[PDB]
Amino acid sequence: TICHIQISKTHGILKTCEENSCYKMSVRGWIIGRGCGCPSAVRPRQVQCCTSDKCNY
């Protein structure tokens, strides 16, 4: 799956993942990561997982 990747001061970067899922990880609304796969996380860490190209916007 093609996923949005989080890189400091660099927007629009995508990665062709071997994984079927993409994720967006946040704390208090602040994005701490965006990438390949679906990682596990407990409060205050919130994960949004999806399985389609560019889904983790």
Side-chain angles (χ1 to χ4, degrees):
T1 308
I2 295 157
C3 308
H4 287 279
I5 302 284
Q6 193 72 12
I7 304 170
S8 304
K9 293 193 163 176
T10 317
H11 294 282
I13 306 306
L14 313 159
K15 176 173 174 185
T16 309
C17 315
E18 276 163 75
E19 297 92 343
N20 193 46
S21 307
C22 302
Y23 79 90
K24 186 160 89 169
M25 195 176 270
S26 69
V27 57
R28 267 176 178 161
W30 304 101
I31 299 131
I32 60 165
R34 283 194 308 166
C36 304
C38 184
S40 52
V42 198
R43 287 177 191 182
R45 218 142 54 120
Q46 312 270 276
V47 208
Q48 282 163 259
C49 294
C50 54
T51 60
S52 62
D53 292 338
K54 302 173 273 185
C55 67
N56 67 327
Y57 176 85

